[PDB]
Amino acid sequence: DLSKQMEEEAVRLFIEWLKNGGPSS
Amino acid sequence: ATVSLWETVQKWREYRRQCQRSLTEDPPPATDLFCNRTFDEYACWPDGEPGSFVNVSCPWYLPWASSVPQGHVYRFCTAEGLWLQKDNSSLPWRDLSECEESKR
Numbered sequence: 001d002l003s004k005q006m007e008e009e010a011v012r013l014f015i016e017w018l019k020n021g022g023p024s025s
Numbered sequence: 026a027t028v029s030l031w032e033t034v035q036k037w038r039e040y041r042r043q044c045q046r047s048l049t050e051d052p053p054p055a056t057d058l059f060c061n062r063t064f065d066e067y068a069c070w071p072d073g074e075p076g077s078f079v080n081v082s083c084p085w086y087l088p089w090a091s092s093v094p095q096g097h098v099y100r101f102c103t104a105e106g107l108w109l110q111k112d113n114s115s116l117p118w119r120d121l122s123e124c125e126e127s128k129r
C-alpha cells in the first residue's frame with residue numbers, strides 16, 4: 001500500500017529523469 | 026495497474042534497444058536535407074522533413090501508456106534541416122504534453 005505508492009513515485013521520478021535527459025545525463 | 030520500477034526500467038531498455046536498431050538500420054532519407062534521427066533517452070525520433078512537425082507515439086514503456094494510445098510527442102524540423110531548439114545552448118524543442126500522466 002504505502003510502499004507500493006512510494007514505488008509509484010520512484011517510477012515517476014525515473015520517467016522525469018529520462019525527460020531531463022537520462023544517461024545524457 | 027501494476028507498479029514496478031524494475032518492469033518499467035526493463036521496458037525502457039527494450040524501447041532503447043529497438044530504437045537503436047531503427048537508428049542503425051532505417052534507410053537514409055530521400056535526400057539530403059533532413060533533421061537527423063536520434064534517441065533523446067525518452068523518445069526515438071526518425072529523420073525529419075525540413076519545415077515540418079515530427080510526431081512519434083507516446084513511448085510504450087510509460088506505465089500509463091495504455092491511457093494515451095493516440096497521444097504523440099512532437100519536435101519541429103526547421104527549413105535548414107536542423108531540429109528547432111530555443112536559445113544558443115538548449116536542447117531541441119519537444120512537446121510531450123499529450124503523453125503526460127494526469128487526467129487534468
Ligand SMILES: CCCCCCCCCCS[C@@H]1O[C@H](CO)[C@@H](O[C@H]2O[C@H](CO)[C@@H](O)[C@H](O)[C@H]2O)[C@H](O)[C@H]1O
Pocket residue numbers: 078079080095097099
Ligand atoms: C505554432 C502552431 C502551428 C501548428 C501548425 C499545424 C500543427 C502540425 C501538427 C503536428 S504533426 C501531426 O500530428 C498528428 C497527430 O497529432 C498526426 O496525425 C496522426 O495522428 C492523429 C492522432 O490524434 C490523427 O488525428 C491522424 O489521423 C493521424 O494521421 C499527423 O500525421 C502529423 O502531421
